[PDB]
């Protein structure tokens, strides 16, 4: 099975990364809420076409999730089906490159919402904001950021992101992927 | 000092039990927000006098917190002063009965907001609601409830509450006080 810890972090992604409207189910409306968030904050900074593209990748994301986790075909992914989906992939995956495709769209989407500045690096202030406007318990933000940047050896970029997302989803033990929940391992 | 774990749970109470408006500081306005919450949900079920009493205990609570943690006298308790306050009491406390007095008002207030039904027991559905309308990651609510009720040996009442609040605030290790963050030890 998955241990407690694993299930805790899986709940974490259900809740914070997918169930935008908080009803205990993943459904297209959750994805429409991502879009609302998107337009909400970017407004006219983005063109109509940009929102359209964004939408197509969300549609395409929902489609891949729905088609993998919705066992009884009612267009709703419940927690239980979402757990089941994770138990199946943890059972056999080894790098970010093995995750189900819907993940390949969730990763960049999550990263770009953190990198408020567009340089492809989430700096400390951006991280601190991640922790705030995402209610996580970051008690020493600089120390959580140092686990991520590994004492300044590693830049918090997309390839760093990818690694941590992976660990958040699959490790049977507290490691750096924990930083995404705003905690130190 | 306090270890990481301890500091994590302390952040938890700052954030969920006191900083209602989310600005990284505890201030009277946070307490006014408790009152707003209170009237928000109880409306006319409570009389004017009941709100007044409630207010007096919050005022009295703020007063005791402010007078213990506000080191530079600016009527704002920051995270750092709140951490400092906790480092001081963990250093020397042994039962719920040793916690600073402001706690003696936070405990019942938190308990009565969980016990939506008024019987002095927070049952499983109430707990489940605690976990929802309080965004915690309860991945198996019945299993978290069984750590609290200890397999049905113990009723989830105020004296049970008190014990767990205590452990949440002071243990240097994962135990039953963790259930209040909606997690299994
Ligand atoms: Ca939903
Ligand atoms: Ca379904
Ligand atoms: Ca950036
Ligand atoms: Ca505040
Ligand atoms: Ca102060
Ligand atoms: Ca009750």
Curated annotation (Swiss-Prot), chains A, B:
Ca(2+) 3 binds at residues 115, 117, 119, 126. Residues 5-41, 57-92, 102-137, 138-173 form the EF-hand domain. Signal peptide: none annotated. PROSITE patterns: EF_HAND_1, EF_HAND_2. Keywords: Calcium, Metal-binding, Muscle protein, Repeat. One of its GO terms (molecular function) is calcium ion binding. Ca(2+) 2 binds at residues 70, 72, 74, 81. InterPro entries: EF-hand-dom_pair (IPR011992), EF_Hand_1_Ca_BS (IPR018247), EF_hand_dom (IPR002048). Ca(2+) 1 binds at residues 19, 21, 23, 25, 30. Like parvalbumins, SCPs seem to be more abundant in fast contracting muscles, but no functional relationship can be established from this distribution. The sarcoplasmic calcium-binding proteins are abundant in the muscle of arthropods, mollusks, annelids, and protochordates. This is Sarcoplasmic calcium-binding proteins II, V, VI, and VII. It comes from Branchiostoma lanceolatum.
């Amino acid at each position: 099975g998955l241990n407690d810890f694993q299930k805790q972090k899986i709940k974490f992604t259900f809740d914070f990364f997918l169930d935008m409207n908080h009803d205990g189910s993943i459904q297209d409306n959750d994805f429409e809420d991502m879009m609302t968030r998107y337009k909400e904050v970017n407004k006219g900074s983005l063109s109509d076409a940009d929102y359209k593209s964004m939408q197509a990748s969300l549609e395409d994301e929902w489609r891949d999730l729905k088609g993998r986790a919705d066992i009884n075909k009612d267009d709703v992914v419940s927690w239980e089906e979402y757990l089941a989906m994770w138990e199946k992939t943890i059972a056999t995956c080894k790098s970010v490159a093995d995750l189900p495709a819907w993940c390949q769209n969730r990763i960049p989407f999550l990263f770009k919402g953190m990198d408020v500045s567009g340089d492809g690096i989430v700096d400390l202030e951006e991280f601190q904001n991640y922790c705030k406007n995402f209610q996580l318990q970051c008690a020493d933000v600089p120390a959580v950021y140092n686990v991520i940047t590994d004492g300044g050896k590693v830049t918090f970029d997309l390839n760093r992101y990818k690694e941590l997302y992976y660990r958040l989803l699959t490790s049977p033990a507290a490691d750096a992927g924990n930083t995404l929940m705003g905690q130190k391992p």
